């Protein structure tokens, strides 16, 4: 199982003029991934400005047919899409080793008294395997 790109610190992710075919990759428009890139590397946003796209399914068709080389997105959604893909042609990169590896919470307003009960309910849902049962139901980690 070969791995061309190791992560965000790749030598490919400096300039595609270093290799003889200039490859291309983009992100989702008006996204927080774009904000994370612009706070990490503005030159990456400059090279992505010519490589923008619109649709997630459009980017999927572009990766399958060959209209796009790589695509930067979130991890678990691509893991679910690869776990139901016909033939498993597209291959993920690692498990977030040279990536952000963040988490998702529940956004509440500043001063809401409901935060403690929601936190206790989430710790009840994780601490009994019921969250693991829901992840087994709604994710399938084949191939």
């Amino acid at each position: 199982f070969v791995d061309q790109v190791t992560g965000l610190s790749d030598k490919k992710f400096q300039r595609p003029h270093d290799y003889s075919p200039p490859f291309r990759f983009g992100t989702v428009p008006n996204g927080s991934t774009e904000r994370n890139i612009r706070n990490n590397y503005p030159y990456m946003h400059q090279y992505m400005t010519r490589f923008n796209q619109r649709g997630v399914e459009d980017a999927l068709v572009s990766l399958k047919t060959g209209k796009l080389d790589a695509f930067i997105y979130d991890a678990a959604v691509l893991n679910y899409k690869a776990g139901r893909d016909e033939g498993c042609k597209l291959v993920t990169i690692g498990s977030g080793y040279i990536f952000a590896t963040t988490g998702y919470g529940i956004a509440l307003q500043k001063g809401s008294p409901w935060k403690r009960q929601i936190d206790l309910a989430l710790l009840q849902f994780v601490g009994d395997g019921e969250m693991e049962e829901l992840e087994t139901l709604w994710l399938t980690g084949i191939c």
Binding site: L8, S9, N39, N40, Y97, A100, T101, E132
Partner: protein, 225 residues
């Protein structure tokens, strides 16, 4: 790891500090003290709530019972659970081994004495037989478990993923299991509502967004031996 993390926090914010240790090798469990019939804590939770400490800077196990008493920050470590074995199927393939569901005196699986994994399996009442089996082999520290499994006295050990991966980088005979369950996170043990909550969590998130986590991986985690 956490020492350089605290150095980064002191570079970030306006404070000095005082690093000390804990008197035992235990995280801290809720147990009835023998007088007055009252459940009390010990360990790092027993020293933090006593006022002798200020901030548990440790890979503390985040669960439901600890958050009922203190407040938490954003987790820095994200990992699951695995089994340390030594290398016929010598592997276990996680909890789903039927020979470990009904154990015997052959397959020796154990855990740290007074650990949060024991409480996490005590809540799980469907595997109480494992609760009655690890109680005969509770070790004080994980280094005792490493010393006992190197001398072929143990056979299995429930522990977190990346620590055993680092020990596998140290010693090539150490092998982790296949199943990756209870993908949880470890953060910094904190006090109640405090002015060191919002600034410190924003500093932790600033450490998450940049490649400083990758730098800390380059110090110890990503490097192998």
């Amino acid at each position: 790891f956490c020492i350089d993390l605290l150095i980064k926090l002191a570079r970030t914010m306006n404070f000095t500090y005082e690093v000390h240790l804990v008197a035992d090798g235990k995280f801290g469990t809720q147990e009835r003290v023998n007088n007055s019939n009252k459940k009390e804590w010990n360990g790092m939770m027993g020293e933090l709530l006593s006022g002798q400490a200020d901030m548990i800077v440790a890979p503390l196990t985040i669960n439901n019972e600890r958050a009922q008493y203190i407040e938490f920050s954003k987790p820095f470590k994200y990992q699951g659970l695995t089994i340390l074995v030594k290398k016929p199927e010598e592997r276990i393939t996680g909890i789903n081994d039927p020979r470990l569901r009904n154990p015997s005196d052959k397959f020796i699986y154990a855990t740290v004495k007074q650990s949060s994994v024991d409480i996490y399996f005590r809540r799980q009442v469907e595997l109480s037989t494992m609760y009655r089996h690890m109680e005969k082999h509770n070790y004080e520290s994980a280094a005792e478990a490493i010393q006992a499994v190197r001398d072929n006295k143990l056979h299995a050990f429930i522990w977190d993923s990346a620590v055993l991966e680092f020990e596998a980088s140290q010693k090539c005979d150490l092998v982790t299991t296949g199943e990756l369950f209870f993908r949880s996170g470890f953060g910094i043990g904190m006090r109640k509502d405090s002015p060191w909550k919002q600034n410190v969590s924003l500093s932790i998130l600033k450490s998450h967004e940049n490649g400083f986590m990758e730098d800390l991986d380059k110090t110890w985690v990503r490097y192998q031996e």
